[PDB]
Amino acid sequence: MEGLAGYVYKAASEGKVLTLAALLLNRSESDIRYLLGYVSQQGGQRSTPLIIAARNGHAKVVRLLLEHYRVQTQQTGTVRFDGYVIDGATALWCAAGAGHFEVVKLLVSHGANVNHTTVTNSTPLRAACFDGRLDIVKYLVENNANISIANKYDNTCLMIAAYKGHTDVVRYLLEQRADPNAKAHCGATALHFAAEAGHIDIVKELIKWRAAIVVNGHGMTPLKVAAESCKADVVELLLSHADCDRRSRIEALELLGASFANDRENYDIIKTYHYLYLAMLERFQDGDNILEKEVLPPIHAYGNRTECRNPQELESIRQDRDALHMEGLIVRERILGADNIDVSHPIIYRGAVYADNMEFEQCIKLWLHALHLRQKGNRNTHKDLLRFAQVFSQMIHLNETVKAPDIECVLRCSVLEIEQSMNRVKNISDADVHNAMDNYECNLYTFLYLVCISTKTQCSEEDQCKINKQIYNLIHLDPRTREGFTLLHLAVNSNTPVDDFHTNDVCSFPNALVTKLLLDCGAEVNAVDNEGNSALHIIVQYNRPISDFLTLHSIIISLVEAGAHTDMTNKQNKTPLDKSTTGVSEILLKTQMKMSLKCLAARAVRANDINYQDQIPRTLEEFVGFH
Amino acid sequence: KHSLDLLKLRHLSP
């Protein structure tokens, strides 16, 4: 009788009071429990009829279910599908998340669990704070709700309310004996989220309640996070707390000026110089000498600038915008170090701007510094190499001689990142195995784009030797995609994706130059994927044998003359002349095919099923296994 | 262009 359960779920989800009354009419107690407790799936979520009735805000349906039928408010289901697959959520949690005060009042009063604990210890009060409705939070808290109960990561009810722009619920919680000194898994308190979001009222009400400013796990006080999030008005109120001393104020002002200098949304120059000069003034106005700062050595990425340690050194860079960007990057680096999460993103954005306004050399310097910083922190540099491929392709399309040491460094960090990605794939079992494999394939494609760009540049002998050394290292690393394609199958396959940006205009696979460069670096020419197709079974399938015949000819003579087997048979029992589908490719392969007694004897051995195990030399067992 | 391409939820569960 699952049909009645499905119709009842539909009637409860869509608020059909009369239809649900007609459906549950003429039913027995066991039937009533079966229909009103059954778990139904209607896209992404497991939910009972009452869970989906309260989650859709159908007050009449929920009140009808609890008045006559002895339904229980402790059922288990799933509610959301925006990165939030949470089990064990009762009807209170669904009602609070959907923000329906009219159902939660009719649900609690009928014997409900106000402080239910789901799988990730999320109280229904947490959902009501997430929505921000004061009426639901107040009703729950008045009905014996715990405020200090948090999830496994210690994200209390107050912190999620402080993260969002809800003011009334935050003020009410701080008025209801809440704890303003919660410590999350990363050390973040309530002030960090409220400051980074940009809510002045939440921060003011917290510092009114003795918020007890403490540095988070990643060496960042709330002032530093507020300044890093480019929130000026948030930072300029914690200085009145009288416990901030002076160095914290100075570093907050300097970080705020830095973040204003190099940001996308709120990009300021008058405000940047105003705050930087305020910080330097408060540094150098003490009178008993100064309040000096330790400064990193001149970083080659930002020219040769040792930031600014002189009153006539900031007054003389008010009128320059590149100098302000460089100084902001330098102070943000010396404040945040290099291992912080959000220290490299302004560098990446400034590099993107410099690429946009045709400053390709400074773009390259800044973006190599960004990749070096991210490699020190071991973050996900899979998009960064793609952006390098796009920038270099734009360089070649503009007939600009790209510097070869830069390409060597990019390739070295590409092979290091590919090794890191292989380690990550070997580590991440199943939680993000598809994401890891997608990142790995993207990294291999970016390395191939860099190789093709390298073939498009006339480098010297030493530079070409270094590029060959990096390609040699990655080839001997032997990467393999999810389809078993090595770096040679993709260099000859016409189906390898090319990024929609300028990389289409330069890196056009298949390339005879890329394949020749790989084969000069000891590429496994006889490499076999999991399907069976070799490096030669793939190229002969090329659908353009006349348009770029040279790019075909010089790629089907480079394979065969190096180490390829012309007659080797894949797992589908297909000679490369059989898997050709092109007269030109078939003839161009047949002209390179030298018949030999070994291939004929191996084919005659394999055809009639002769037991060739341990009766032939070990190097001929794989030979017979080919044909 | 280049700038027009650059455009934690586990800890932010409701």
XYZ file of C-alpha atoms in Angstrom:
641
model
C 0.000 0.000 0.000
C 2.837 2.373 -0.863
C 0.479 4.302 -3.150
C -1.451 5.697 -0.192
C 1.848 6.701 1.425
C 2.943 8.488 -1.748
C -0.373 10.317 -2.085
C -0.251 11.282 1.607
C 3.290 12.616 1.211
C 2.153 14.658 -1.788
C -0.896 15.975 0.079
C 1.214 16.950 3.093
C 3.970 18.626 1.068
C 1.502 20.760 -0.923
C -0.756 21.613 2.023
C -3.839 19.696 0.877
C -5.900 19.566 4.063
C -9.004 18.091 2.419
C -7.049 15.593 0.307
C -5.036 14.371 3.306
C -8.226 14.121 5.371
C -9.827 12.022 2.621
C -6.687 9.884 2.277
C -6.339 9.038 5.966
C -10.096 8.511 6.243
C -11.152 4.887 6.849
C -7.781 3.686 8.140
C -6.730 1.561 11.112
C -4.194 2.435 13.806
C -1.436 0.300 12.271
C -2.357 1.761 8.879
C -2.314 5.247 10.414
C 1.202 4.708 11.766
C 2.399 3.224 8.471
C 1.058 6.165 6.453
C 2.185 8.855 8.922
C 5.654 7.454 9.624
C 6.749 6.183 6.222
C 9.920 7.682 4.744
C 9.392 9.019 1.216
C 11.844 10.444 -1.316
C 10.694 13.165 -3.734
C 14.064 14.367 -4.970
C 17.302 14.418 -3.015
C 15.776 14.202 0.458
C 14.315 11.488 2.649
C 11.368 12.975 4.510
C 8.276 11.763 6.307
C 4.855 13.310 5.577
C 4.972 15.402 8.757
C 8.576 16.525 8.210
C 7.691 17.810 4.739
C 4.389 19.244 6.003
C 6.141 21.334 8.652
C 9.048 22.175 6.338
C 6.659 23.655 3.752
C 4.912 25.772 6.398
C 1.503 24.096 6.184
C 0.151 24.992 9.614
C -3.284 23.482 8.944
C -1.810 20.130 7.869
C 0.546 19.924 10.857
C -2.207 20.926 13.291
C -4.495 18.305 11.730
C -1.830 15.606 12.090
C -1.200 16.329 15.788
C -4.782 16.933 16.957
C -6.526 13.640 16.126
C -3.740 11.286 15.025
C -1.256 10.429 17.791
C 1.702 11.392 15.632
C 5.166 11.783 17.149
C 7.497 14.743 16.620
C 10.735 12.713 16.797
C 10.958 11.351 13.249
C 14.091 11.270 11.094
C 14.610 12.774 7.642
C 16.699 14.943 5.299
C 15.746 18.524 4.515
C 18.134 20.476 2.272
C 20.119 19.932 -0.930
C 22.501 22.895 -1.162
C 25.705 21.201 -0.041
C 23.768 20.344 3.137
C 22.876 16.643 3.344
C 21.951 16.377 7.026
C 20.182 13.369 8.532
C 18.273 13.009 11.783
C 16.500 16.352 11.404
C 13.169 16.243 13.222
C 10.155 18.429 12.464
C 11.391 21.214 14.770
C 14.632 21.508 12.810
C 12.773 21.628 9.491
C 10.309 24.222 10.792
C 13.090 26.419 12.181
C 15.162 26.151 9.004
C 12.175 27.060 6.848
C 11.350 29.877 9.273
C 7.676 29.160 9.937
C 6.737 30.496 13.372
C 3.140 29.367 12.905
C 4.043 25.671 12.705
C 6.788 25.585 15.359
C 4.359 27.057 17.900
C 1.802 24.371 17.008
C 4.532 21.697 17.093
C 6.211 22.410 20.448
C 2.886 22.707 22.290
C 1.965 19.144 21.240
C 4.834 17.466 23.099
C 7.939 18.121 21.016
C 11.716 18.085 21.451
C 12.836 21.714 21.682
C 16.508 20.747 22.085
C 16.672 17.815 19.671
C 20.168 16.849 18.515
C 20.565 15.727 14.902
C 23.520 13.825 13.432
C 25.818 16.879 13.300
C 24.559 18.038 16.736
C 22.529 20.908 15.229
C 19.835 22.082 17.629
C 16.585 23.410 16.116
C 17.654 26.720 17.666
C 20.617 26.713 15.268
C 18.312 26.568 12.238
C 16.102 29.367 13.574
C 19.213 31.473 14.182
C 20.364 30.654 10.640
C 17.089 31.991 9.258
C 17.196 34.881 11.720
C 13.565 34.982 12.843
C 13.440 36.351 16.380
C 10.002 34.879 17.089
C 11.099 31.274 16.538
C 14.335 31.703 18.513
C 12.519 33.382 21.404
C 9.802 30.718 21.504
C 12.381 27.922 21.464
C 14.619 29.496 24.128
C 11.642 30.218 26.383
C 10.605 26.571 25.909
C 13.720 25.120 27.593
C 16.284 25.276 24.786
C 20.020 24.955 25.347
C 22.024 27.837 23.905
C 25.550 26.487 24.520
C 24.964 23.255 22.569
C 26.986 23.331 19.350
C 27.993 20.893 16.635
C 31.179 18.816 16.556
C 33.096 21.833 15.188
C 31.846 24.042 18.071
C 29.654 26.395 16.036
C 27.203 27.577 18.686
C 23.812 29.161 18.075
C 25.337 32.609 18.597
C 28.117 32.159 16.033
C 25.862 31.209 13.119
C 23.603 34.122 14.064
C 26.652 36.399 14.154
C 27.839 35.079 10.784
C 24.664 36.279 9.066
C 23.257 39.796 9.102
C 20.609 39.146 11.756
C 20.786 41.727 14.540
C 17.685 41.112 16.667
C 18.446 37.436 17.306
C 22.065 38.248 18.192
C 21.068 40.973 20.651
C 18.434 38.668 22.145
C 20.932 35.829 22.556
C 23.485 38.130 24.189
C 20.625 39.211 26.469
C 19.868 35.541 27.256
C 23.028 34.444 29.106
C 24.804 33.293 25.965
C 28.549 32.690 25.754
C 30.563 35.247 23.730
C 33.844 33.301 24.068
C 33.141 30.208 21.987
C 36.161 28.517 20.394
C 35.629 26.725 17.081
C 37.857 24.060 15.524
C 39.994 26.733 13.833
C 40.027 28.985 16.901
C 37.448 31.382 15.464
C 35.260 33.084 18.057
C 32.028 34.979 17.454
C 33.850 38.217 16.612
C 35.746 36.716 13.671
C 32.681 35.753 11.624
C 30.739 38.900 12.538
C 33.722 41.091 11.657
C 34.523 39.366 8.361
C 30.866 39.448 7.298
C 30.646 43.205 7.828
C 27.938 43.660 10.466
C 28.820 46.596 12.710
C 25.838 46.074 15.012
C 26.701 42.458 15.882
C 30.301 43.383 16.697
C 29.180 46.383 18.761
C 26.732 44.265 20.759
C 29.398 41.607 21.320
C 32.058 44.065 22.511
C 29.363 45.561 24.731
C 29.007 42.087 26.299
C 32.762 41.778 27.035
C 33.516 39.792 23.899
C 37.012 38.920 25.238
C 39.057 39.390 22.060
C 41.388 36.411 21.603
C 43.596 35.423 18.674
C 42.115 32.620 16.579
C 43.909 29.425 15.589
C 45.583 30.835 12.480
C 47.302 33.751 14.226
C 44.601 36.344 13.489
C 42.853 38.604 15.980
C 39.323 39.759 15.031
C 40.722 43.162 14.018
C 43.019 41.448 11.523
C 40.150 39.446 10.014
C 37.958 42.555 9.803
C 40.750 44.507 8.105
C 41.477 41.595 5.758
C 37.808 41.498 4.747
C 38.103 45.171 3.654
C 35.588 46.336 6.287
C 36.648 49.816 7.388
C 33.759 50.706 9.700
C 34.088 47.423 11.613
C 37.777 47.978 12.408
C 37.317 51.591 13.549
C 35.182 50.616 16.562
C 37.323 48.021 18.364
C 40.055 50.619 18.997
C 37.801 52.218 21.634
C 37.800 49.012 23.717
C 40.852 50.419 25.621
C 42.506 46.962 25.776
C 43.823 46.909 22.193
C 47.223 48.421 23.176
C 49.011 50.037 20.212
C 50.736 47.433 18.025
C 47.420 45.673 17.373
C 45.878 48.980 16.278
C 48.798 49.667 13.944
C 48.732 46.232 12.345
C 44.947 46.459 11.940
C 45.256 49.813 10.163
C 48.111 48.590 7.955
C 46.228 45.421 7.010
C 43.107 47.471 6.253
C 45.108 49.768 3.989
C 46.670 46.743 2.305
C 43.326 45.033 1.711
C 41.875 48.275 0.355
C 44.836 48.617 -2.017
C 44.353 45.229 -3.722
C 40.749 44.021 -3.816
C 38.097 43.546 -6.468
C 34.784 44.761 -5.047
C 35.886 47.650 -2.808
C 39.004 48.878 -4.599
C 39.988 52.263 -3.164
C 43.002 54.531 -3.566
C 42.061 57.613 -1.539
C 40.929 55.366 1.315
C 43.991 53.141 0.876
C 46.466 56.004 1.170
C 44.376 57.631 3.906
C 44.505 54.534 6.107
C 48.137 53.742 5.269
C 49.155 57.289 6.180
C 47.118 57.104 9.387
C 48.969 53.911 10.320
C 52.378 55.376 9.462
C 51.519 58.587 11.312
C 50.541 56.713 14.475
C 53.760 54.724 14.042
C 56.068 57.731 13.718
C 54.318 60.339 15.905
C 55.291 58.835 19.272
C 58.198 61.252 19.775
C 60.388 58.974 21.893
C 62.123 57.825 18.720
C 59.632 55.800 16.651
C 57.624 52.569 16.657
C 59.515 50.763 13.903
C 58.460 47.660 11.964
C 60.481 44.724 10.653
C 60.245 44.672 6.852
C 60.831 41.761 4.498
C 63.661 42.087 1.947
C 62.810 43.583 -1.475
C 60.699 40.964 -3.239
C 61.466 40.698 -6.952
C 57.775 40.209 -7.761
C 56.920 43.722 -6.531
C 59.822 45.360 -8.346
C 62.587 46.434 -5.979
C 60.450 48.162 -3.346
C 61.365 47.896 0.351
C 57.849 49.130 1.178
C 58.017 52.570 2.897
C 59.948 53.623 6.025
C 60.093 57.399 5.616
C 57.611 60.301 5.789
C 58.778 61.401 2.309
C 58.324 57.848 1.004
C 54.553 57.693 1.485
C 53.967 61.332 0.564
C 55.743 60.568 -2.736
C 53.644 57.502 -3.640
C 50.213 59.014 -3.006
C 50.118 59.946 -6.700
C 51.010 56.494 -8.086
C 48.584 53.579 -8.300
C 51.043 50.793 -9.153
C 53.164 51.810 -6.164
C 50.125 51.622 -3.886
C 49.319 48.124 -5.158
C 52.907 46.990 -4.590
C 53.044 48.495 -1.099
C 49.685 46.989 -0.158
C 50.846 43.574 -1.334
C 54.088 43.941 0.639
C 52.453 44.953 3.924
C 49.740 42.304 3.548
C 52.474 39.715 3.005
C 54.567 40.845 5.972
C 51.495 40.883 8.224
C 49.846 37.642 7.088
C 53.136 35.837 6.446
C 53.008 33.251 3.681
C 51.122 30.262 5.154
C 47.771 32.020 5.556
C 44.825 30.964 3.414
C 43.851 34.340 1.956
C 47.266 35.936 1.450
C 47.702 34.862 -2.197
C 44.291 35.828 -3.600
C 45.002 39.607 -3.769
C 48.274 38.752 -5.522
C 46.335 36.660 -8.041
C 43.797 39.439 -8.613
C 46.517 42.064 -9.073
C 48.249 39.774 -11.545
C 44.973 39.372 -13.425
C 44.520 43.151 -13.577
C 48.099 43.604 -14.780
C 47.505 41.002 -17.488
C 44.298 42.786 -18.483
C 46.007 46.167 -18.932
C 48.983 44.652 -20.828
C 51.684 44.383 -18.156
C 52.453 40.748 -18.881
C 55.897 40.704 -17.241
C 54.614 42.010 -13.908
C 51.669 39.614 -14.192
C 54.152 36.761 -14.549
C 56.241 37.922 -11.590
C 53.221 38.340 -9.304
C 51.631 35.053 -10.335
C 54.839 33.044 -9.866
C 55.055 34.608 -6.412
C 51.439 33.560 -5.833
C 52.100 29.972 -6.896
C 55.217 29.842 -4.709
C 53.212 31.083 -1.713
C 50.467 28.547 -2.419
C 53.005 25.725 -2.798
C 54.461 26.674 0.586
C 50.944 26.376 2.000
C 50.169 23.316 -0.164
C 46.820 24.631 -1.387
C 44.890 23.671 -4.542
C 46.843 25.125 -7.466
C 44.867 23.536 -10.284
C 43.216 26.714 -11.596
C 46.427 28.730 -11.249
C 48.292 26.638 -13.826
C 45.286 26.958 -16.141
C 45.453 30.739 -15.800
C 49.168 30.564 -16.611
C 48.354 28.546 -19.725
C 45.796 31.169 -20.738
C 48.211 34.057 -20.127
C 51.018 32.371 -22.072
C 48.660 31.560 -24.946
C 47.617 35.217 -24.987
C 51.320 36.120 -25.031
C 51.993 33.885 -28.037
C 48.863 35.128 -29.811
C 50.253 38.655 -29.323
C 53.656 37.613 -30.763
C 55.409 38.365 -27.463
C 58.613 36.511 -26.585
C 57.668 34.833 -23.313
C 60.623 34.484 -20.958
C 61.901 30.921 -20.763
C 62.963 30.820 -17.048
C 59.370 31.746 -16.209
C 58.101 28.808 -18.272
C 60.670 26.543 -16.598
C 59.496 27.608 -13.129
C 55.832 27.191 -14.108
C 56.556 23.709 -15.466
C 58.538 22.750 -12.354
C 55.677 23.775 -10.098
C 53.274 22.019 -12.485
C 55.110 18.704 -12.121
C 55.384 19.230 -8.353
C 51.640 19.905 -8.203
C 50.904 16.851 -10.361
C 52.905 14.709 -7.933
C 50.954 16.330 -5.085
C 47.698 15.535 -6.900
C 48.771 11.911 -7.342
C 49.455 11.748 -3.600
C 46.037 13.295 -2.908
C 44.343 10.721 -5.149
C 46.253 7.985 -3.317
C 45.039 9.492 -0.008
C 41.406 10.536 -0.615
C 39.655 7.155 -0.744
C 36.027 7.965 -1.567
C 34.973 11.312 -0.038
C 36.232 13.334 -3.020
C 37.653 10.710 -5.380
C 35.823 12.136 -8.406
C 36.874 15.678 -7.482
C 40.484 14.547 -7.040
C 40.471 12.744 -10.394
C 38.963 15.802 -12.095
C 41.668 17.999 -10.561
C 44.304 15.491 -11.697
C 43.010 15.478 -15.282
C 42.853 19.282 -15.271
C 46.455 19.446 -14.042
C 47.613 17.069 -16.781
C 45.784 19.134 -19.400
C 47.393 22.322 -18.077
C 50.829 20.697 -18.217
C 50.155 19.742 -21.834
C 49.115 23.328 -22.589
C 52.374 24.546 -21.051
C 54.289 22.009 -23.157
C 52.571 23.238 -26.320
C 53.344 26.842 -25.381
C 56.965 25.787 -24.846
C 57.049 24.372 -28.375
C 55.711 27.734 -29.609
C 58.632 29.698 -28.111
C 62.176 29.910 -29.482
C 64.286 29.306 -26.389
C 68.063 29.001 -26.151
C 69.970 25.733 -25.735
C 70.066 25.791 -21.926
C 66.421 26.837 -21.591
C 65.273 24.092 -23.958
C 67.424 21.593 -22.053
C 65.808 22.630 -18.762
C 62.310 22.324 -20.241
C 63.315 18.888 -21.525
C 64.546 17.979 -18.038
C 61.225 18.954 -16.448
C 59.283 17.021 -19.091
C 61.679 14.104 -18.530
C 60.911 14.121 -14.806
C 57.160 14.207 -15.384
C 57.314 11.515 -18.090
C 59.285 9.208 -15.804
C 56.650 9.974 -13.181
C 54.244 8.367 -15.725
C 50.899 10.099 -15.111
C 47.684 8.352 -16.123
C 44.231 9.902 -16.438
C 40.990 8.177 -15.448
C 40.782 6.624 -18.937
C 44.351 5.320 -18.781
C 45.688 7.938 -21.195
C 49.312 8.875 -20.551
C 50.908 12.165 -21.578
C 51.319 10.698 -25.080
C 47.759 9.525 -25.737
C 46.480 13.018 -24.934
C 49.136 14.669 -27.110
C 47.746 12.776 -30.123
C 44.037 12.589 -29.225
C 41.788 15.138 -30.916
C 39.227 14.796 -28.097
C 41.383 16.374 -25.382
C 39.620 19.531 -24.154
C 41.209 22.942 -24.598
C 40.183 25.778 -22.299
C 37.657 28.229 -23.730
C 40.020 31.171 -23.166
C 42.973 32.116 -25.413
C 44.453 28.590 -25.134
C 42.339 27.565 -28.139
C 44.388 29.951 -30.279
C 47.773 28.345 -29.537
C 47.472 24.889 -27.957
C 45.658 22.880 -30.636
C 45.963 19.146 -30.026
C 47.091 16.916 -31.666
C 50.535 18.469 -32.171
C 53.490 16.909 -33.940
C 55.771 19.281 -32.026
C 54.367 18.259 -28.627
C 54.624 14.553 -29.447
C 58.183 14.945 -30.745
C 59.139 16.883 -27.608
C 57.639 14.190 -25.380
C 59.330 11.381 -27.322
C 62.632 13.237 -26.958
C 62.095 12.922 -23.182
C 61.737 9.136 -23.038
C 57.960 8.939 -23.353
C 56.442 5.463 -23.165
C 55.441 5.198 -26.815
C 53.936 1.715 -26.357
C 51.796 2.892 -23.429
C 48.395 1.224 -23.126
C 45.276 2.622 -21.473
C 42.646 0.598 -19.627
C 40.684 0.363 -22.885
C 43.715 -1.016 -24.740
C 44.323 1.660 -27.378
C 48.009 2.501 -27.734
C 49.511 5.851 -28.690
C 49.170 4.756 -32.326
C 45.579 3.463 -32.233
C 44.448 6.956 -31.204
C 46.247 9.127 -33.759
C 45.137 7.025 -36.736
C 41.529 7.895 -35.816
C 42.157 11.576 -36.577
C 39.288 13.100 -38.552
C 41.390 15.788 -40.298
C 43.980 14.012 -42.464
C 44.173 16.729 -45.148
C 43.784 20.059 -43.334
C 46.857 19.537 -41.116
C 48.443 16.557 -42.863
C 51.895 17.645 -41.702
C 50.686 17.750 -38.090
C 49.460 14.224 -38.823
C 52.448 13.022 -40.844
C 55.078 14.306 -38.427
C 53.087 12.706 -35.591
C 52.630 9.271 -37.197
C 56.233 9.035 -38.367
C 57.575 10.264 -35.012
C 55.737 7.533 -33.108
C 56.668 4.651 -35.412
C 60.300 5.656 -35.907
C 60.877 6.028 -32.147
C 59.524 2.868 -30.556
C 55.956 2.201 -31.631
C 54.664 -1.194 -32.698
C 52.635 -0.865 -35.880
C 50.851 -4.221 -35.535
C 50.183 -4.213 -31.788
C 46.670 -5.308 -30.884
C 44.491 -3.647 -28.264
C 42.060 -5.456 -25.977
C 39.336 -5.376 -28.662
C 41.437 -7.459 -31.103
C 41.997 -4.576 -33.525
C 45.140 -3.893 -35.526
C 45.798 -0.130 -35.915
C 44.834 -0.442 -39.584
C 41.468 -1.797 -38.448
C 40.893 1.072 -35.991
C 41.713 3.750 -38.571
C 38.477 4.958 -40.256
C 40.525 7.138 -42.624
C 42.183 6.245 -45.912
C 44.974 8.792 -45.517
C 45.908 7.685 -42.001
C 45.766 4.016 -43.004
C 48.088 4.582 -45.970
C 50.420 6.805 -43.941
C 50.696 4.064 -41.331
C 51.087 1.277 -43.894
C 54.011 3.130 -45.469
C 55.728 2.952 -42.052
C 54.822 -0.719 -41.502
C 57.752 -3.096 -41.928
C 56.648 -6.718 -41.934
C 58.731 -8.958 -39.708
C 58.842 -12.649 -38.908
C 58.323 -11.886 -35.220
C 54.924 -10.267 -35.760
C 53.760 -13.039 -38.098
C 54.890 -15.754 -35.678
C 53.269 -13.957 -32.729
C 49.987 -13.550 -34.609
C 50.044 -17.209 -35.642
C 50.724 -18.151 -32.013
C 47.888 -16.017 -30.645
C 45.370 -17.038 -33.311
C 45.303 -20.784 -32.583
C 45.693 -20.543 -28.771
C 49.127 -22.052 -28.189
C 50.150 -22.229 -24.523
C 53.045 -19.755 -24.496
C 53.511 -19.399 -20.728
C 57.134 -19.873 -19.563
C 58.095 -21.580 -22.852
C 59.322 -18.328 -24.439
C 61.690 -15.633 -23.167
C 60.154 -13.224 -20.686
C 60.436 -10.312 -23.105
C 58.441 -12.246 -25.723
C 55.540 -13.052 -23.394
C 54.486 -9.402 -23.493
C 55.314 -9.372 -27.214
C 52.879 -12.219 -27.879
C 50.441 -10.527 -25.504
C 50.452 -7.488 -27.783
C 49.329 -9.175 -30.994
C 38.880 39.103 -19.947
C 41.186 37.984 -17.138
C 39.690 39.784 -14.135
C 36.179 38.637 -15.129
C 36.993 34.962 -14.513
C 37.919 34.936 -10.827
C 34.309 35.433 -9.673
C 33.786 26.414 4.309
C 30.118 25.418 4.135
C 30.874 22.389 6.339
C 31.423 24.649 9.365
C 28.370 26.756 8.412
C 25.728 24.039 8.723
C 22.332 25.344 9.968
